[PDB]
Amino acid sequence: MQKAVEITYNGKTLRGMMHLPDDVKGKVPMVIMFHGFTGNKVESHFIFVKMSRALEKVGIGSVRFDFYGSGESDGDFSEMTFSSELEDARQILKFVKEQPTTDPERIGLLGLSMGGAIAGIVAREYKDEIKALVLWAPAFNMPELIMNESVKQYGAIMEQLGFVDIGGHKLSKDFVEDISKLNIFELSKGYDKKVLIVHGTNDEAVEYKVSDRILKEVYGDNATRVTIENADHTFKSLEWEKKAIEESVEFFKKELLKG
Amino acid sequence: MQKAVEITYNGKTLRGMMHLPDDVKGKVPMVIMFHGFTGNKVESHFIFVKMSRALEKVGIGSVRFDFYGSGESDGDFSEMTFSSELEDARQILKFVKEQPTTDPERIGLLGLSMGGAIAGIVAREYKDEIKALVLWAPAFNMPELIMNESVKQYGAIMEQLGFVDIGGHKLSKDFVEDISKLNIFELSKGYDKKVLIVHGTNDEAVEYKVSDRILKEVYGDNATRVTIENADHTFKSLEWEKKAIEESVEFFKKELLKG
Ligand SMILES: CCCCCCCCCC
């Protein structure tokens, strides 16, 4: 089953999609999915929609919302900061916990790229009530990526206009100010439940090396990695996305439907 | 106001969004928006969403749905053909005409890229009940574009396995066969009401020359062209998308709110 949903808080409306399995009644595991920077709840080549459908077939529900300033949700992209998306995510978790079909002890988080950074942070903040975590090419070095640009052209453009054009999106100076103060690696450290990282070797947006840091610096033996050979950042082929979705579904089926 | 909407016909469910202006009540002009090949109802850098919001402010509502096989709607991409998207468009027009806030004589069509080809055809099929037409880089040469793509890129796999991977999407042989039988220029010819074409000069997906053909071969003096200098296919900058949205909003404001 697929139904559209909304959240309204602080005068902000988030719009999303909720998937519940047709077969099983009662309370079910739920996966919350976080899209990345300039992405949206559907994500690249619909990989999020696919994931939800692949999950409901194993009796796992899911919700996917567009962050404020993106896609179907209200707001201008210029109003968005990483911290504001964090607050959106805290409200989304609250919404999932309020649904009468949600099993409170079976809630997982999934995040792609910058959504992986968010998912990491949220996982830590609620480490005792988030059952499992999947990270897809998680952009934990996002602060560093924004910082390096200070000496390049986007830095000079930001210094002059207070915003930059990243391809039909207005990236505010407020985002640079906000993100410069955060260390995703440290803010994600301390999550003890099982973690799955899926990463491509040819990822030219978040290099594969980043995942090594996460394995070394953020988690212990509870974290494991699926390497998708030859894959680009968003797993943009049928075989690459099939591998990502199947490994992640099996991880959530093992980790959420056991407890 | 923005609300999620659905259509179900012949065992298929389409999912979309409906925008109505808050201040004006009664029947209002309505714009139907058609996304392009591998796109979705939000479209590139949220330009469709923005276009809907810009329309609300001038008292024009809108609907944007994902075609069957894309985005939030049902179905796999392999099930989609150009003709199935035409049938979806006919059902979406039907849906708009059933809404009690729709002024039946004030319905306009907008299409981007392959969706513009959709709009061009639908406008002709309903030439007496479609009040105005906007085409954004309309891909009337889509049969030729796909034919060139098979000959140079797809290859034997299409014959051996029946499909090709176009970037996380399974493009079926049926689409190639179906689209080869259609002439978008001929099927759109005969629409007499006002038409706006917006096109970028550096468009590398649908060459600017195509718009020249549409002005000469498809429409008469009822058609007008806004050229956006240096712009790419989806007008992917703040300046380019502002120009496209404002020109289209003022065109729909003049042509739907008159007569
Ligand atoms: C991976 C991030 C791509 C966009 C970065 C833009 C940097 C702006 C700095 C002023």
Author numbering:
A (entry chain A), B (entry chain B): 1 to 259
Task: Provide the publication's sentences verbatim.
To rule out that the presence of glycerol in the Tth MAG lipase structure is due to the addition of glycerol in the cryo-protectant buffer, we determined an additional Tth MAG lipase structure without using glycerol in any sample preparation step and cryo-protection prior to X-ray data collection. In this structure, glycerol is found in a literally identical active site position in five out of six protein chains of the respective asymmetric unit, confirming its origin to be independent from a specific crystallization and cryo-protection protocol.
Lipases are enzymes that reversibly catalyze the hydrolysis and synthesis of a large variety of glycerol esters. A minimal lid domain comprising the residues 141-183 is inserted between strand β6 and helix αE on top of the CD active-site area. Different from most other lipases, in which the lid is generally formed by a bundle of α-helices, in Tth MAG lipase this domain is compact. It is formed by two small α-helices, followed by a β-hairpin and an additional α-helix, referred to as α-helix/β-hairpin/α-helix (HBH).
